[PDB]
Each structure stands twice: as structure tokens, then as C-alpha cells.
A paper describes a structure:
Thus, TaqCad1 is a dual functional enzyme mediated by cOAs, both as a ring nuclease in regulating Csx1 and itself, and as a deaminase to accumulate the level of ITP. TaqCad1 assembles from three pairs of monomers (CARF dimer) to form the hexamer with a pseudo-D3 symmetry. The ADA domains create a donut-shaped core, while the CARF domains extend outward in a propeller-like configuration.
The classified dimers were then mapped back to the originating hexamers, revealing those with one, two, or three intact dimers, respectively. For the cA4- and ATP-bound TaqCad1, the hexamers with one or two intact dimers were also reconstructed for comparing individual subunit structures within the hexamers. We first analyzed ATP binding features in the heterogeneous cA4, ATP-bound structures. We displayed the densities around the ATP binding sites for the hexamers containing one, two, or three intact CARF dimers. The hexamer containing a single CARF dimer shows weak but convincing densities for four bound ATP molecules, two linked to the intact CARF dimer and two immediately adjacent to them. Whereas the cA4-bound and intact dimers are in the T conformation, the adjacent cA4-free dimers adopt a hybrid R and T conformation (R/T) including the notable alternative Trp472 conformation as observed in cA4-bound dimers. This observation suggests that binding of cA4 to a CARF interface not only activates its linked but also the adjacent ADA domains, likely through the protein network formed by the ADA interfaces I & II, providing the molecular basis for a sequential conformational activation model.
Author numbering:
A (entry chain L), D (entry chain H): 219 to 611
B (entry chain G): 219 to 612
C (entry chain K): 219 to 435, 444 to 612
E (entry chain A): 392 to 435, 444 to 469
F (entry chain B): 470 to 547
The structure:
């Protein structure tokens, strides 16, 4: 019974302790997954309402109506949400363009984004979430990057107060730095000053808990990421999370762990190919952020297989290796899946996956989260509220 | 019309122009200096209402008039503000313990501090001021350093908008990297991060224009500050001023100019010892900001000497070497002297200083201010209104 | 129920769960701490038997009996498990000069030293131990530091195979690279290169798991160490700078801090050290004898022992013995004197220090599964009658 | 009379002041500009007698006439000095091949290049000149770079002492480190060491006032410059000037102002592209030295336009932004025109340029010059004799 | 040989002036008496002597007043 | 590269230093400090290629004799 992830999970009927050790079914477990207290660690604010009804619930709430960019017709590929072929990384980002930097440069639209994203998290029974936003991308002449960030924190804090304590998703903000750094260096340290300042203005509720180092994928940005002083952010308590991904550079992942002191690696899909890096990423406690739907639509993986293979999703191999893996959503709108759908899609990507393994990902996520001693004492008290199975056999 | 700093002093009557070249009279010219549109560059906000009737008025404005610390009795040296013998900076910095860290943590006391200070700036006819504040010292559990800073800016911004354009003193903010109390890399990283964010939150009115690198005296405070990357400060447009008082350390001034890229030197009273450093300061146009009363009280100088001596005030020596010298007040309350008084003391401190030297120091200050093109155009328009003399009869 | 660190403490009768939350008895619980499966993370090989009778046993079975330097004179301070006053560190080092570099720079003696130390670990019911050695300190003109290290590993490896698997104490080596503030810097280079080479040589049984740092309390010297999967632990004893623990965590990439008794001074270091999982190695007897702490106080003051404060803050605190012979106290004794130093320490906290050590050990996946299973069999209480 | 650059312009009658604010006429103002006390801050010694009669005058005074290189065929592009199309830097550099480090290696020819150049400076009524030379390029087996530098300084000093004080141009020397790509980084060390030695040797008359980083237009010598430790040249009182490379890079300029402590920038024609860099350059007081003819022939700009544009000469944009802009001649021989000719071209390159703008540029040059307190007090006394207009209406 | 002596927090201009003088004199004279190297009476500064090595000047370290192999 | 090897790697031998004569200062430093230049004739010919069976010393000729005449310690290897 010691193999169980949660201490409260041991004191169950013996039948359920055998059900949890049985492979998860992606069709009949939609109700059990839909009630699990979940943790979200890789969520982008810009890619939430990128098309559909949500894209018009935000545009109808704009402060000024006549300034919104006209809705362009971005054709979602066929087979979507599950494309028959990968669409690449560049096409994946371009899919969500009716939101982000063009729709949320408005007090009204940005408030519909924060408020609509919180209800979606509550609809998925998420107990903790680190939302990744770029305030510097949304700043107009009158709206400073601090004004934008100060409103995002206040909108989420307002949502967290109107809900009861037991149905309350605790939202924390990660500040991402990407895109513009390829043409300047002032922005890389202009964005690290917000985090240091934002990490001190607020001490309770919604807080800026870390700095998200997007742009670690490119090579010139990586030149400026190690050409920047990161000790000031380390002293102030901010944690560092990095985007790995298409660039399959083992040397890049090595520098982040030991030069930037990164505590989480995003989209580390090619980590098993280096056996020496896997151990270091497994003994030091580094948490890997995996996104099932967002990786199938950008890289492609075999679905509905029978036995493990050479191009299988690395979720199973990481768990055996001891790596602390976590399943996330990446882009709730640019993709079409909630945190429940992603957890269910890891039964057609990873053959033989156990239901208890789905619970371990929410225990690893509950330890990788950049929360304090108070936030992480109410998160574990909510993961112990896992619902009893509906079938049991 | 050969060597005239202000260009409005060219259609100047020859009788008055010759009067401009005569030595300044400390007692008679008090009325003329009082009407001069001056520039302030070294003014510590927390040393304004240190004692006297001004200290009390900051204390009935307290939002919570029960947590106010008691009034500690801090006697002044006899003969203040002109002490018989210099008291040193350690004793000097303790005279203003009734205001500062204790007090100014109440939101009401800070608002009175900012508004009362602005009133004293209009009384001296100051056209541009750069107040040095440390928001990290007035912060509490419910008041972060950013909240304190945003309150200080909005108190000065309101006062600016309530004044006519022709009689308005434009106030800017400098963030001070504190003395030996500072030096921790977790504290100098917070001070610079706040300055970078505040340098961009505001683009009109009262603004944050630079960081004051106090504690340069401490040898342990150095090399924690040379170990921090000041490049992001320079990229965002923040100017660096170094508070180089209370020693002759020639190898520290050399590194501030060329490593920290500092643009102003505070209390550089030993520049004449190193002629090589004096040429670099004069040629590169680094402004040396001198504080007459604060220097006389802290370290002492001869007064009313007939001829220039070895220990004489270096104000005229700096001017002869083409150094952009500026005269400031340092601490309005602790020193117990206004900007007008500081200019008049130069006659006693520096023998034979002409009335054109005083006007030159104000032109030097206008060039050394951390002001953008919009504020410079307004400051230059105010410096062209030189008051007409009254005693041009000898 | 979701507060015990092992999913086996929960499924007990109600009274046992109630006896754990009571303060640990430093007398009655002697028979129960002795039966606990402990984990040792701060043990020095050069201080096992520095005087007494075990000095003779190591001295008896040398291989060059005409070389053994004569026994010097070591006055133990008054009583000494527990000194009346601190003796300092530099004095504390010289309390064990009858054993170490001199005696162990002889093939026969070094066999006894590793053979006897493993004997002590078994008697204490230790399921895991990371021993610290300095092979370059035992080298001669015909016994290179590699030869010394290879002998040490096989002596521990031989003992492990001679003991049954149920009672086996898995031992791993931890090379100590000490910063000579006056001495030559080559021995820093030799030790690091020796650990980088030993990392790949052995993959089963006794292994060289990491490098220890007695000094710098060196950033560029440790980049190669991190490539080969070696974990660095930094001594943080004498001196009281925060900037040393601040550059050990983020420049040397340290994963364990030894004798860090002044973390509470800084309020940001405690959060960082308690949010990244950095473990603090504490030695009750060694810290008491070196620096001195109030004992038997009925309340927690300003100078009290920081174990309970660290535990409240979430810092992963382990309890160790540092030097066995020099301190003259076993792991159970160190685990019992903590009650005297820390008033109100519950007996579940003592169980907490062992779980934290299990997560702090430099063992691999296979090593951890044997260590975790062995910790599952927690001994049932004996004196539960009140 | 509150923004007049020169204090002596306030005493003018209030009828010429109206003329002073009118746009510069490049045809009717030839006589007025020719009598203006001018300042030359960018003038290469090796590109003066590159062709024409001046080349043969220099070639005729050689001490070793048998060693004179043959006069090669250098065809100037058609339409010179106003090329029909830009000819580029590399082609522009090769126009001055009949003069340079071929004739100047002869001690006799060096006198002609140094004494004829001074005679061309008095024709333009220049009150202060900063000639930049590379003594290491004219060295021989029996003539070290220090020997060449002594002759250059003493040839200009002799001419300076044979001219009246109210008619004498004060010539100062700048040493150029011309970026040998990798093969010779000892040339940079040799160049900087020569400047430091000469910075203390002479304290009166002609002096070595600074070092010219003409090699900043590269990528490996820019890296060589950025690791050269310019600290010693800063302690001996030497100023630093940097050639803003033809490559449109902003990261180089940011390091020239804050890492090399440069006090001037040469051909900084792309400062407006970064609005944050133009603000720092305008506030710190860095002087941008612009050559109209050298820029119109190398890069090419629209001429005689009736209004501004997206490709117009950046003189007006820099002046409006509060930047210290100076007009120079660069290579006075290769460009085939004088300082007076360059000033009148701004009426064609920059439409609407006023006659008070050219006066401002001379005031900017007088403040950007690397002169001491003695040479500056004599330069201002010469700039106060502004010639009275000959038209007035 | 030109001696570039580090001072106890004294002057730093002479350590650079002597190095520049040595670099110039190494190329100035090629017969008879010559400047053949620089003497370092301090640091016993690694970024201050790259120009010395790039020109072929030999350096001799003038150790003293200490017993340190470092 | 030959500069950083000598003065930053503290090299005592240089392998395949066929372009030493391009920098007279570097050649003089190598000769004076006694740094040995190890040359491989067949490997250099097969990789770089040099004229063969000439009668005089050309610009592209193999740099052995030039290095020996300059006082450099040259070694021939396989
Ligand atoms: N897979 C990825 N790889 C690299 N960068 C990514 C990736 N996914 C998101 N980003 C970065 O995340 C940043 C934040 O995206 P977000 O969804 O919050 O909207 P946004 O900033 O408005 O987007 P955009 O930059 O596309 O207009 C974007 O700048 C994008 O550069
Ligand atoms: N060297 C200095 N460093 C920092 N602040 C200074 C200094 N000299 C004067 N001050 C004033 O101190 C203010 C912040 O510090 P604080 O008000 O606590 O003063 P203090 O000198 O530390 O002591 P006190 O509060 O007793 O006056 C600054 O805004 C400035 O007004
Ligand atoms: N508790 C400690 N604190 C600091 N340094 C220590 C400590 N214990 C040992 N060292 C250092 O580690 C080395 C000794 O390690 P070890 O105890 O394994 O061998 P030893 O037999 O005691 O050696 P030696 O006789 O050379 O001291 C020496 O550098 C000693 O300074
Ligand atoms: N416009 C320019 N941009 C960049 N570098 C330049 C420019 N003009 C000249 N230089 C550099 O200045 C160096 C010295 O120029 P100068 O005219 O004084 O010498 P020179 O005798 O003409 O030299 P050379 O024969 O090598 O061209 C030239 O070698 C060239 O490297
Ligand atoms: Mg010992
Ligand atoms: Mg030429
Ligand atoms: Zn992300
Ligand atoms: Zn001050
Ligand atoms: Zn040039």
C-alpha cells in the first residue's frame, strides 16, 4: 500500500486499491477524472478565447466597441481537436490570433479574459493554477505594463473572493518573456523588474510566484538569457520555469538546470534520448511539464496502440525513470481540451497507463507548484478529496 | 557680451552688467538671491521637517495619531546652523531622528511631508527640483515600497497641478540606494527593480529620473554594487548619481564615472588633490553638487577669510577648472538653511566670489538635471527671468 | 491522516497514533529509538575510533606494526558526551589525532577502520549511510589516492555482501574536497577528478555518490562534477555568513547544507532553503560540543536549537553524528539528546527527521526502494501505559 | 533671444535675426558660410591629396622620389562629387589609393600632406580641427610609429606657430585603431599604447587628444575592442570616438556609450530606429558627427526634396530630438569638397534647414571637441565673430 | 626592463603608463640598448597584460614579502 | 587560436601550426618561449596540400625551413 501516492489513499476498500492499479479507460472514466481536484501549471492567458463562442463573449464586453480588430477567418485543420497530421509549431501559434495582443489591449476585454478563464478552471474542478501572462504585451500608451499586470492580479483575486473556500481555485501568475527579446536586450531585464516588484506588492491571494523564460528555444535569445543577471530574482524568492521544445538541445536543458537554476522544464519530450540527463532531471526533483493535446497537434504521436514503441509518448518512460511529470493544457483556446480531456487523452497516447498514474501526475504537480507554505497546505488538503469510483469493478 | 552663461544677460544695462561682475554681498544681496529662479538637485525628502514648528505640523496630520513615535530630544550644536566646530556626519545624521524612518510610515504624515516640502520649494522660487527618497524605508506590512513610492509621486503631482504654470516647481524623484544599512544584494536588487518599473509607469509630470547610489563611502558597500549589473538601469534611461562624501577616495570616483557611468558626484570636496581626475570631471561634464551648510557643519571650513587658502572651500577652485559645480541644500531641516541661504554662504566660504558665479552655478545645475527635452525647455524659459538689481549705485 | 510521512503510520490503532504526537521521552524511549531503522548522512571516516579501546583494535591489526605513530595524549573535556562549555572547532579537530591520517595511512589499519565502522552502523540498525573519506589524505609513494579509494570501497562492499540482506546497511562514499585556506589548491583538483572518475567506475553496491566541501563557507570548478551526476554537499559550520549559503545553493548547486544553524537569521534564505528542497544536516552532539546550546530549558528562547524552528518553516532537517569517536556518541544518542536541546519535540518529529534524510540521500532509484521499504517497518511502541 | 546658441547673437539688430531664422540657401549663402569660423572633428589625414593637382604637389616634394609608387588609374564615379547612385564604402575607400600609406611613408611627402592640409584648413576659416591619423601605417624599418607621430605633430605645430592668433587653426590629433580582423590584435595594443605615451608627452600646442575607434565597423574587432580594457586610456585623459558601423545594429552603439565610454559617434544615421537609444544619446550628450558628402556618396539620400520623408537625411530629426549633431568632411580629398561645401549641402539634403541650424551645429562641435580649458576658451572667442549677413532681406 | 609596481591602494595610472611606454619602446629601438621586457612588482591583474604578450614583451614577476605558492 | 593556446591554455606544444609565419610577433614569441611545433608532412599534404618537388622557396611552400631558420622547435610526426 506504500506505492500509493497520497497518504489518505491507503485507507480505502481493498477492491478500490485494485481498481486504481488497472489501466484507465478514456471513455468510461470521463466522470471520475471530471471530479478530481486538479492542478494546472502550464496555461497561457492569451490562448483561452481564440475562436468560437468565447471569442465573442470577450469582444462583446470591450470597453470601446469600435477599436476591436476585425475577426479574421483562421481555418482550424480537419480532424481537430485531433488532427490527422501535426500542424507544426508556427501554425499552432498562428491559430489563436483573434485573441491575445490585439483583443486584450482593452480594459473591458482583458477583464472578460480573467473572469472567463476562472469559471473554466472551476468548471474543471481545478484547485490550483499558475497562469502565464505577459503584461508587457498588453500595454498601451496610457496603460503601463504594471497597470496591465495590476489588473490581471485584481481580476483573479476578485474571482477568488466571490467563491466559497472549498470551491475556490487559487490562481497565481507567472510572468513570461518572449517574442520581442530577439530584437533588443532592454526587454529581457525590463520584464524581470516587474516580477521582482510584483513579487513584493502582493503577499496574499493571487501572487506573481515566478518568471517564465520563454524564448529559450531560440539561439540568440538563449544568448541573452545567459547574458542576464538572474541572482536578483533568486534572492527575492521568484522561481524560474523554462520553455524547452522543438530545439532538441541536450546542452540547453543542462544549462537551465545549473546556470539559471530552473525548477521546471516545459515540453521536455526528448529527455529519454539522453540517459545521463534523465537521471539528473530525476534526482534533483526537476518537474517536467507535459501537454498531451498540445504535443499531438504540434509533433504527432501514435494513438490507439497495443504495446510500447520507439515513438510513443514519453509519459510512461519518465514515470518509470522517476521524473516528476505533470499534465497540463498549454492553450485552452488554441487547442480544444480542458485539464480533464488532457488527462483522458493519456490513455490513447500511452498504452497500458494506470489510473493510479493519473493520480501521481497530480501529486507531482502539487509539489512542482510555486506556492508557499500556506498555499501548499490547503492544496494537499484538497487532493485528499478524490472521489470514489463509480464502477469499482 | 564675452562670457555670459544665460543668453538673456546680453541686453543687460552696462551699469547692472558691471554690478554682475562684482563680489557678492551676503547681507545686502539677500533680497536679490531670494528672487532668483533656482534649481535643486540634492534634497533629501526625509530630512525636511526634522525639528522645530515644521516637525509638529507633520505630526498632527497623522492618519493614525496613536502609533506616532515619541518626540526624542535631539539638541542642536550651539551656534546653529553655523556650528563652532564641525560635528561630523555620524552626529549630523542623528539630528533628524524625529523624522524619517520613524514617522512617514503613517499615510497622513507622508502626505504632509510631501506637500509641506513643495511649499518650501515655492518660497525659494525653485523652478526644478530632484527630491531623493527611499520608499523601501517607509514601507510597512500593508504598505509595500511600490505603494509608498506611488503615494510620494502622486502627492507631488497634485501640488504641481494646483500651481500656475509660471510659478510651478517641477519635481522629479531619485531613488536612493541607502548607506551601510544597505549593501545586501537582495536589497540593491529591489531598489533597482523599483526604479526600472517606476521609470516607465510615469512619462508625464512627476517622474523617477535616476537612482542615488548612497553608501559609496563604505568599502563593503562597494563591489556589491560593482557586482550588480547596471546595464538594465542604463537601457531604461535612468541616470546614476553617486553620493561620494566623507573621504578622499580617488580610485572610487574613477570607477563611478567609467564603471557605474555616473553623471553627478555628490560632495566631491577633494577633487583638487588629484589634478588628473579634475581634468576628466571637467572635460566629461560630470556635475559636482556641493552643499555649503552641510559641508561647513559636517567637516568645517574657514569663514570670511580675506585671501584664498589651502583649506578654503573648493567652489572657486572647481569653477576655475571648468567643473560643472552646483549648490544645493542637502537636508532642508537638519541643516536649517534654505537654498537662498546656501548661495549667500558662498560669499563667506569663498572670498571674492562674484555675483556672476552664483548665476553660473544655476546654469550648471540646469545642464546637469535629469530632465527630458520637454522639461528642459520649461526650465530654460524660467532661468531667463533674472531679477533686476536694486543696489546698482555703490 | 494525511500528515504522516509514510503511508504505513496511518493504519495503526488509535492509541499508537496518539502516542506519536506526545513529546519524546529521552529516557524511556531509549529502547525504541535504538530499534528505529536510521539513516546516516553526515559521518566522517577519519573520526570513527579516535581514542579509547577501538583505537587499539585498529592499531592492533596493522600491516606495518613498526610504523604506527605512538599514542599521543588527548584530554577529553569534563564528562564529554556533553561538555560543560563549548571547546570550539579547531580544538575539536585535534581531539581525534590518534586515528585518521596517521594510523590509516597503512594498508592493515585501513582495513580495520572500514571493517569496524561498518560494525558500529549495524549495531545502530542503520539502513543507509553516506560515509565521507579523503583518499588523497591516505596516499603514499606506492599507494595512490585511487588505490586508497578502491580499497575503501571494497572493504565496505565486502562487509555488505557478508551481511544478510535483511540487516544490510547500504554504504555509499562521499569524497571530501576541503578548501585549504592556506594549503595547496591541487588537492582540490585531485579530489574532484577522483570523484568524477569513481562515478562511472562503479554502478552497483558501494558507490561514490557525491563530493563534500569543507571550505568556501569555487563555482567554475564544479561544472564537470554536475555533468557526471555527482551531488555536492557543502559544510556550513564555523563563520556565520548568509552569502555563503546563498552562493552554495545557486552557484555550487548544493543539495544539502551541513551544520547550518543560523538560517533563521535571514527571512529570505529560510524560504528559499525550504522551497527548493535543500536539506540541512544537523548534528546534536557535535554542535553542542563545538558551539554549545542551552539544554533542558522548559521554553524555547532565542538561543535554542533551531531544529523545531526549521521543521516548522518546512526545512528538510536531518539528524546525524558527524564524528563518531571525536563526538563520542552514536546516532541513537544524537537522536535522543535532541529532546534535551529542543523542548516539546514530539516523537513523530524524530520520525520526520528520518523521512527527510531518506529524501535527502544521494541514492538512486534502486537504492531508494530498499531504503523506503526498510523504513516502512517502523517499530511498534513499547512503553505506552503512561 | 532665449534659445540663441551664441550669446553674441542677442546683440544683433532685430532685422538680421529674422534672416537668421530663414531657411538656408545653398547658392546665395556661399559667401556667408565661407567666412564662418568652423570646427572640424572628422578629417582623415590619409585622404586629403587623393587625386588632382594636390596629389602631384605632394608627390613632387618626396625625399626619395625613386621610391614613389606609380600613379594608378583611379576612375571617379560619374557625376562626382554628386554621384548618380551610391558607390558603397569599399568603392569609396579605394578612391584614395594614390595617397595614403604609399606616399606618406616618405618623410618628404609627409610634410606636404601635413602642411598643405593646414593650408586647406585656413581657407575654410576653421578655428579648430581634430585630424585623425594612423602613425603605424606610415612606419618603416628606420621609422617607428612613434617617430612618425612626432613628425606629424611637429609639422602641424610648426604651421600653427607661423599663423596669427586670430587666424590660426588649432589642430589636435586623434589616433585610429583600424580593426585588423584577427590577424593583428597587437596593432590595437600598439595603437593604444602609442596614444597613452603621446597623451602625456605634449601638453601645449598640438596634442593627441583621443583615440579613434575606426575599427568599430566589424564584428570580430568589435569583439576585440570590447575586450581591450580601455581603462588605461581613460586615466590618461584620452577621449574615445567610435565609428558607427554601416551595419544597422543598435547593440553595438549601446556598448560604445556605456562600455567603451565613447563621447562621440561617427555616421550614426540609424538612431531614430530605436527611440530609446536616441533619448539616451540626447540626454547624456553624446555628439553625432555626420558627413553629408561622405554619406550622400556612400549610402545615397534624396536630394532637393520639398518636404521630409521616410528616407531623408536625419539631421532635422536629430536636432529636434535634442541631439548634438555636427557636420564634418570625413575624407576631404576622396569626397572632393571642403567643410563649407558640406554645410551648404544640408539645404539640399534636409529641406527647410534654417541658417540658425548651421550655427547650432558649430556650437555643438565646439562643445564636443576634445579640447582642454585653454583651447576651449580660445575657440569660443573665435566663434563669437559671426559674420554679418550680406543680404539682410 | 620597465617595472610596473602595484601599490597599496595608491596610484593605478603608472601601472598602465609603464606598460604603454614599454610597448612603445619595444618597437622604437632595435639596436644597441633596448627595452626587452616589463617587471611586475605586484599581483604576486590578469586582464592588464594581454597587450604586453601580444607584442612579444617578456614579463618577469618580482615576488617578495610573502610565502605563498599561489 | 595560436595566441590563446600559448597564453590562455599554457600549451607547451602546438600541433599543425602551419600559419605561424603570418604573425611575426607570434612566431618570435613561439621561438623565444621554446614552444615546439609538431608537423605531420603526409597528413598536412593530404588535408591542406602543398607544392612538391620545387627548386626554390615559394609563398605556398611547406613552412618547415622557415620555422627552423626562425629558431622554432619543429618536430616531424605521423
Ligand atoms: N510553444 C511555445 N513556444 C514558444 N513560445 C510560446 C509557446 N507557446 C506560447 N509561447 C509564447 O507565449 C507568449 C504568451 O502567449 P499568450 O497566449 O499569453 O498570448 P499573447 O502574448 O497575446 O500572444 P502572441 O504573442 O502570439 O500575440 C507568446 O508571446 C508566445 O511567444
Ligand atoms: N545617506 C542617506 N541615505 C539614505 N537616505 C538618506 C541619506 N541622507 C538622508 N537621507 C534621508 O533619509 C530618507 C530615507 O531614510 P530615513 O528617512 O529613514 O532617514 P535616516 O537618515 O535613515 O534616519 P531618520 O529617519 O532618523 O532621519 C531619504 O528619503 C532621505 O530623505
Ligand atoms: N567537521 C568538519 N568540519 C570541517 N572540516 C572538516 C570536518 N571534518 C573533517 N574536515 C576536514 O576534512 C579533512 C579530514 O577528513 P576526514 O575526517 O575524512 O579525515 P581525517 O582522518 O580526519 O584526516 P586528517 O587527519 O588529514 O585531518 C580535513 O580537511 C579536515 O579539515
Ligand atoms: N569611412 C570609414 N569607415 C571606416 N573606417 C575608415 C573609414 N575611412 C577610413 N577608415 C579606416 O581608417 C584607416 C586610416 O585612414 P587614413 O586615411 O588616415 O589612412 P590611409 O593612409 O588612407 O590608409 P589605408 O591606405 O590603409 O587606407 C584606414 O586604414 C581605414 O581602415
Ligand atoms: Mg583528522
Ligand atoms: Mg587610404
Ligand atoms: Zn508556457
Ligand atoms: Zn546626500
Ligand atoms: Zn572616419
Amino acid at each position: 500500500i506504500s506505492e500509493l501516492p497520497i497518504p489518505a489513499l491507503a485507507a480505502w476498500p481493498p477492491s478500490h486499491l485494485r481498481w486504481l492499479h488497472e489501466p484507465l479507460d478514456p471513455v468510461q472514466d470521463k466522470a471520475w477524472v471530471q471530479a478530481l481536484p486538479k492542478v494546472e501549471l502550464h496555461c497561457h492567458l492569451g490562448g483561452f478565447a481564440t475562436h468560437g463562442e468565447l471569442l465573442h463573449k470577450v469582444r462583446q464586453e470591450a470597453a470601446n466597441p469600435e477599436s476591436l480588430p476585425p475577426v479574421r477567418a483562421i481555418p482550424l485543420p480537419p480532424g481537430w481537436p485531433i488532427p490527422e497530421e501535426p500542424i507544426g509549431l508556427e501554425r499552432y501559434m498562428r491559430l489563436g490570433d483573434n485573441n491575445g495582443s490585439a483583443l486584450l489591449k482593452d480594459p473591458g476585454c482583458l477583464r472578460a479574459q480573467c473572469r472567463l478563464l476562472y469559471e473554466a478552471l472551476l468548471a474543471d474542478h481545478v484547485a490550483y493554477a499558475e497562469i502565464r501572462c505577459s503584461p508587457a504585451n498588453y500595454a498601451s500608451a496610457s496603460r503601463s505594463p504594471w497597470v496591465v499586470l495590476q489588473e490581471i492580479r485584481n481580476h483573479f483575486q476578485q474571482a477568488m473572493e466571490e467563491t466559497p473556500e472549498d470551491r475556490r481555485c487559487h490562481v497565481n501568475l507567472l510572468l513570461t518573456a518572449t517574442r520581442e527579446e530577439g530584437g533588443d536586450r532592454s526587454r529581457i531585464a525590463r520584464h524581470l523588474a516587474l516580477a521582482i516588484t510584483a513579487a513584493e506588492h502582493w503577499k496574499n491571494g493571487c501572487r506573481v510566484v515566478g518568471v517564465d523564460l520563454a524564448g529559450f528555444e531560440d539561439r540568440t535569445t538563449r544568448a541573452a538569457m545567459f547574458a542576464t543577471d538572474f541572482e536578483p530574482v533568486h534572492r527575492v524568492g521568484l522561481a524560474v520555469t523554462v520553455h524547452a521544445g522543438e530545439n532538441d538541445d541536450v546542452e540547453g536543458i543542462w544549462q537551465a538546470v545549473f546556470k539559471l537554476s530552473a525548477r521546471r522544464l516545459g515540453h521536455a519530450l526528448h529527455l529519454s534520448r539522453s540517459p545521463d540527463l534523465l537521471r539528473v532531471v530525476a534526482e534533483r526533483g526537476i518537474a517536467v511539464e507535459l501537454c498531451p493535446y498540445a504535443n499531438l497537434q504540434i509533433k504527432g504521436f501514435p494513438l490507439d496502440e497495443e504495446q510500447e514503441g520507439s515513438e510513443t509518448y514519453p509519459l510512461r518512460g519518465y514515470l518509470a525513470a522517476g521524473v516528476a511529470v505533470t499534465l497540463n493544457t498549454d492553450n485552452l483556446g488554441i487547442s480544444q481540451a480542458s485539464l480533464t480531456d488532457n488527462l483522458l487523452l493519456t490513455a490513447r497516447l500511452c498504452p497500458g497507463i494506470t489510473r493510479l498514474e493519473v493520480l501521481k501526475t497530480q501529486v507531482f504537480a502539487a509539489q512542482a507548484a510555486f506556492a508557499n507554505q500556506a498555499e501548499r497546505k490547503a492544496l494537499w488538503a484538497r487532493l485528499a478529496q478524490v472521489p470514489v469510483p463509480t464502477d469499482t469493478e
